[PDB]
Design a protein around this nucleic acid. Structure first.
Ligand SMILES: Nc1nc2c(ncn2[C@@H]2O[C@H](COP(=O)(O)OP(=O)(O)O)[C@@H](O)[C@H]2O)c(=O)[nH]1
Ligand SMILES: [Mg+2]
Ligand SMILES: [Mg+2]
Ligand SMILES: [Mg+2]
Ligand SMILES: [Mg+2]
Ligand SMILES: [Mg+2]
Ligand SMILES: [Mg+2]
Ligand SMILES: [Mg+2]
Ligand SMILES: [Mg+2]
Ligand SMILES: [Mg+2]
Ligand SMILES: [Mg+2]
Ligand SMILES: [Mg+2]
Ligand SMILES: [Mg+2]
Ligand SMILES: [Mg+2]
Ligand SMILES: [Mg+2]
Ligand SMILES: [Mg+2]
Ligand SMILES: [Mg+2]
Ligand SMILES: [Mg+2]
Ligand SMILES: [Mg+2]
Lengths: 401, 57, 80, 109, 120, 93
RNA sequence: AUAUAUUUUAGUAAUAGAUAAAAAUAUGUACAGUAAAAUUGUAAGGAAAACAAUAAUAACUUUCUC
RNA sequence: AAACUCCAUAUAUAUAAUUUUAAUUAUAUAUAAUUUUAUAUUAUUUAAUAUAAAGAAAGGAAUUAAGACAAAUCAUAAUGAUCCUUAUAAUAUGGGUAAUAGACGUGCUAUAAUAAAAUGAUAAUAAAAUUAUAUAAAAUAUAUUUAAUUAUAUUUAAUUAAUAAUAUAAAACAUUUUAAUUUUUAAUAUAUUUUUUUAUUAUAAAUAUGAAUUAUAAUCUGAAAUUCGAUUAUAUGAAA
């Protein structure tokens, strides 16, 4: 008893998935570029078209945000938060960050800005938004024999596709291969005539490698090969990113069960192990400017692990595996992860946001009409808990109290 | 038409029945037929002899 | 004692004399666990009112004696 | 609740080698798997060389054709087993059956 | 559609849960163990199963104690209880509650299905 | 009321053409309780069977040659005769 | 081992014996056979369900054999 | 009757070497209201409405008279009369008070998506009360390959208490999941909705509700758990 047009989903899903961004005002806002941050240092800025294209493919813009409020997802540049982070990324020798903060402070937005910057500066981006998919057991998996770990060839395929599409092909096909690669063929065409696909050293490309389509049991092998290729190449920078890394840290054991009925460890998987290797000084990328940018989510569980990894708490040895996994900490220490605290909004920034919302026509009538502007701003600041952006946004729009 | 129990009964009945389970008739050549007769007759004689031996004993 | 450790529930009885010569054992215990040492001995287990004759089962070995002497009468209704 | 001319069970007269096999199976496989069976009664039989007994539905599940698959036979039916000897009298027939490993328990006539 | 060991299954039915629902011998833990042995990802659906995969569950199911024999053991247990002049056996025969309950009022479920031939 | 399988027209077996029912039978080896094997013709498809409870391990067939079990199993550490002597005072009866 | 094509099988159903006192075609003809009761038994089975058994071989023919 | 009374409230004073700390408290002693004042608007100096300025100022408990109902209690206890005194008095062992056709109250749990379940350790936020016929912390072991959870066992740290323990309150709020529901899944492509979209293929009246009833195994208390107790596990999964 359902039509195509009617809304059948729950609220959060509906807001994400039903395009109510359709009925919205076009806004001629400035464009996000790191080279011209001096112009737009503390102003709202729409992303470039290319950036948007890349960012959507990656999975930067998320469901629980209020990206439905505008024509397209929008951020502002911040001197204390985003700009400073970008400068650190540019300058630091290690280039290896974990974006920490309170729930709703704007970690994913920071990640999206970092991605956009990377796109602008001719870099490949391997984004893993929501590791919950590979960590929790809701897709097929298999123990590979060559690689001593469990591969996940539904998730992997999706990740490969994202990598292919998020990045431009000219930058991606500038990379020649280091080794030759045999794979099982899995096209509808030429299945009889082509059971095996071969990529040569100099002739073939990384783009071509990505476009390969194998059976599930070779997909993990393909992924491994791709990562190796990207590590070897020194022509283009590789930005690796993992958002909701908190889940990964806490969920040490996956929901998958091996032959004997017991839970599989995250480092015994392909994806989680690979990710950990990337984080640590192990799969070292040949080029400079090649970063790993991790991001915590307030959604996920909190425990002693991440604080212990960083310069926060001394290592209590007696706390349990559930609330403190030491292997993960050790791995984090190995690859010198310098954490980045996202600061809460200043008064001026809050005011600027409120002004933008007014321009876009999100503010309620009781806020605008018959009220001093400065007083309203102060109230908004108070209700957000002194500049939590999400909380502020909620007070503005989702209050109706 | 029929229940699962009825079906299973029919199957059981079939197991016992000669319907479409039995081969062709054992036809022989005349020489073969004679050979068979000589085999059977000799055997019967042997059996009789054995019976007499046991009976005599 | 129900729990496997510390089991079974043992009671003093005139067992050996019954074993020697078939003299039924009039139990008023009802909570003594039956043992393998008395299968094929005649017991006369109390029912509240009247002692109940039972030749202890080979399968009864796990159970209590009172489980085989049903105390209440089988219920009925006078359809008036 | 019995009508006239209604199909109700079945019979089978075994003779020679099949009969012998059936007896051997009874002696070895089936009648030992009956738990508390003393024997065929000594008061059982015809006046002249015929002895009989019967198996419950519980007892038929020990036959190897039945025994091999419990699943194929949900239901199972008891049976009477009339053994006919070439004996002049019944004690002779009983003795003969004993020779073929049939146990006999009751007080003889 | 997807048949396995005689029991029919609708598609999109999570395998372990479906197994628990249908097969008498198994609950939650047993179904999970079976899935682990065979190597299905948890929350895999019944429609996703290939023909070789289905057979191994049937092969697994067959290996495990199931259904009529498992029911028989419980029916056998109650038959055993009945045989020996036991209180529990007596309760089973008379269709009253067995587990030391009250029956002045509310003993309707027991009356309905405390038989010697229990299950159905 | 009466559950039946309703008969079709019967197939006419002509006089002389009636053939004896030779059922399909396999030669089946029965190993009894002890290692004595015996061949028997059988309709079920199983070349070998080994039996647990036979005449060759039943006391009735060879006189010259599980609640209790459960109890023994779960009161095994105690080892339960001496025990009888200990727990058998014949004063009270 | 697997794919397609062309076939073949599976519609699973009783009598297997000139059937012989369960029931069913009640008139022709041909061939063949014998019932019942009572008694002794046998799983539920009991006075009363089904199945088994219950008169005599002198002489004759054929077969094997001392 | 009201009032004095108690609890709770507001204020003041006292005391507490601010390690028995919670001073944001506890407890003795006061004071405080059955609130006051003024402007108007209706009805006759007052009384209800409204407005204003002054205040922390707004509840609950106990107390339920006379008579009546020959209301309830001789089973809290006591006493009158009357009856029993080897029994209607006294002690032990077991059984019963838990029986089950129908019926009648009180409750509890349910019949799923404005509602159920997993999870949430710099442990979100309470109060009141108990612990020398005790309260039992941490930690080890088993159920259970990680560990946590829950349940037992092992063994008693601390305190007989503003000091330690019972005891990290729970809803809340947040992520995840949820059949009925082809209102979803997974194979392909697809892309500026990517924890997602579109296309084409295949996915065909009690559940992944409920927890009655029963089977087996363990554990707890006790000397003892059969009639007849309480947990945990693996199955069972009515009715609704
Ligand atoms: N920094 C920043 N954040 C914003 C802006 N606009 C909205 N946000 C909010 O940033 C939030 C993302 O915070 P995040 O740290 O991902 O929350 P978490 O997932 O709970 O950790 C969203 O909820 C947005 O509402 C902006 O212009 N800048
Ligand atoms: Mg986040
Ligand atoms: Mg089930
Ligand atoms: Mg008063
Ligand atoms: Mg203090
Ligand atoms: Mg009064
Ligand atoms: Mg009165
Ligand atoms: Mg009265
Ligand atoms: Mg009195
Ligand atoms: Mg008295
Ligand atoms: Mg007493
Ligand atoms: Mg009572
Ligand atoms: Mg009441
Ligand atoms: Mg519900
Ligand atoms: Mg503890
Ligand atoms: Mg305390
Ligand atoms: Mg909490
Ligand atoms: Mg129903
Ligand atoms: Mg349930």
């Amino acid at each position: 008893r359902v039509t195509p047009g009617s809304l059948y989903k729950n609220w959060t899903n509906t807001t994400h998935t039903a395009q109510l961004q359709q009925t919205a005002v076009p806004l001629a806002l400035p464009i996000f570029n790191f080279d011209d941050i001096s112009k737009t240092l503390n102003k709202v800025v729409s992303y470039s078209n290319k950036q948007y294209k890349s960012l959507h493919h990656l999975g930067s813009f998320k469901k629980s945000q209020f990206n439905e409020l505008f024509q397209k997802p929008v951020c502002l540049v911040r001197e204390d938060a985003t700009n400073s982070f970008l400068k650190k990324l540019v300058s630091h020798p290690v280039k290896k960050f974990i974006i920490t903060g309170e729930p709703g402070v704007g970690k994913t937005v920071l990640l999206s800005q970092a991605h956009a910057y990377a796109v602008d500066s001719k870099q490949i981006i391997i984004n893993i938004s929501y590791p919950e998919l590979f960590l929790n057991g809701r897709n097929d998996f298999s123990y590979d024999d060559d690689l001593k770990l469990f591969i996940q060839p539904m998730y992997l395929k999706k990740l490969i596709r994202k990598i292919l599409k998020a990045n431009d092909p000219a930058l991606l096909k500038s990379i020649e291969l280091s080794k030759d690669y045999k794979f099982s063929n899995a096209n509808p065409k030429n299945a009889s005539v082509k059971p095996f696909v071969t990529l040569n050293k100099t002739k073939n490309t990384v783009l071509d490698l990505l476009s390969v389509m194998t059976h599930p049991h070779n997909r993990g092998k393909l992924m491994k090969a791709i990562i190796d290729e990207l590590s070897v190449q020194s022509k283009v920078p590789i930005m690796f990113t993992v958002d909701n890394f908190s889940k990964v840290l806490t969920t040490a054991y996956s929901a998958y069960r091996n032959t004997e009925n017991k839970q599989i460890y995250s480092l015994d998987l392909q994806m989680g192990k690979l990710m950990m290797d990337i984080i640590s000084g192990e799969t070292k990328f040949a080029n400079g400017e090649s970063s790993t940018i991790l991001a915590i989510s307030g959604v996920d569980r909190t425990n002693k692990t991440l604080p212990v990894a960083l310069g926060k708490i001394p290592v209590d040895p007696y706390v349990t595996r559930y609330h403190y996994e030491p292997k993960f900490v050790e791995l984090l220490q190995k690859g010198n992860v310098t954490e980045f605290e996202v600061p809460k909004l200043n008064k001026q920034e809050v005011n600027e946001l409120i002004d933008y919302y007014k321009q876009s026509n999100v503010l309620l009538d009781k806020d605008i009409t018959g009220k001093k502007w400065e007083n309203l701003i102060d109230e908004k600041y108070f209700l957000s808990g002194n500049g939590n952006p999400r909380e502020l946004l909620k007070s503005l729009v989702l209050s109706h109290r | 038409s029929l229940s699962p129990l009825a079906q299973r009964v029919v199957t059981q009945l079939s197991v016992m029945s000669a319907s479409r389970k039995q081969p062709k008739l054992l036809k022989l050549a005349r020489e073969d037929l004679i050979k068979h007769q000589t085999i059977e007759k000799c055997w019967s004689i042997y059996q009789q002899q054995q019976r007499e031996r046991r009976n005599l004993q | 004692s129900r729990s496997v450790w510390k089991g079974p529930n043992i009671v003093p009885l005139p067992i050996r004399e019954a074993m020697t010569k078939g003299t039924p054992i009039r139990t008023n215990a009802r909570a003594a666990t039956i043992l393998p040492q008395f299968v094929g001995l005649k017991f006369q287990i109390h029912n509240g009112k009247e002692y109940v004759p039972i030749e202890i089962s080979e399968d009864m070995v796990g159970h209590k004696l009172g489980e085989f002497a049903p105390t209440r009468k089988r219920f009925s209704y006078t359809q008036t | 609740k019995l009508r006239k001319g209604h199909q109700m069970g079945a019979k089978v007269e075994l003779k020679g080698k099949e009969m012998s096999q059936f007896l051997s199976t009874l002696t070895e496989i089936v009648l030992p798997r009956i738990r508390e069976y003393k024997g065929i009664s000594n008061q059982s039989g015809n006046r002249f060389g015929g002895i009989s007994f019967g198996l419950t539905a519980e007892d038929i599940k020990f036959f190897p054709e039945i025994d091999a698959n419990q699943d194929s036979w949900p239901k199972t039916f008891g049976m009477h087993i009339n053994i006919n000897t070439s004996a002049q009298l019944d004690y002779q027939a009983r003795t003969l059956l004993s020779g073929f490993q049939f146990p006999f328990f009751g007080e003889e006539k | 559609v997807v048949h396995i060991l005689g029991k029919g299954f609708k598609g999109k039915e999570v395998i372990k849960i479906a197994l628990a629902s249908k097969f008498y011998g198994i609950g939650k833990t047993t179904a999970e163990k079976i899935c682990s042995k065979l190597g299905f990802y948890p929350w895999m659906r019944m429609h996703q199963l290939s023909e070789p995969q289905i057979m191994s569950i049937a092969s697994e199911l067959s290996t495990m104690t199931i259904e009529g024999d498992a029911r028989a053991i419980v029916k056998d247990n109650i038959a055993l209880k009945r045989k020996i002049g036991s209180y529990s056996g007596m309760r089973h025969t008379l269709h009253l509650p067995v587990r030391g309950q009250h029956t002045r009022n509310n003993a309707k479920t027991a009356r309905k299905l405390n038989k010697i031939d229990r299950r159905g | 009321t009466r559950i039946t399988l309703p008969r079709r027209p019967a197939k006419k077996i002509q006089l002389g053409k009636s053939r004896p029912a030779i059922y399909h039978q396999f030669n089946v080896k029965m190993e009894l309780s002890d290692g004595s094997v015996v061949i028997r013709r059988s309709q079920y498809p199983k070349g070998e069977i080994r039996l647990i409870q036979d005449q060759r391990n039943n006391p009735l067939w060879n006189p010259s040659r599980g609640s209790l079990d459960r109890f023994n199993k779960r009161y095994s550490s105690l080892f339960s005769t001496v025990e009888l002597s200990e727990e058998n005072k014949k004063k009270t009866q």
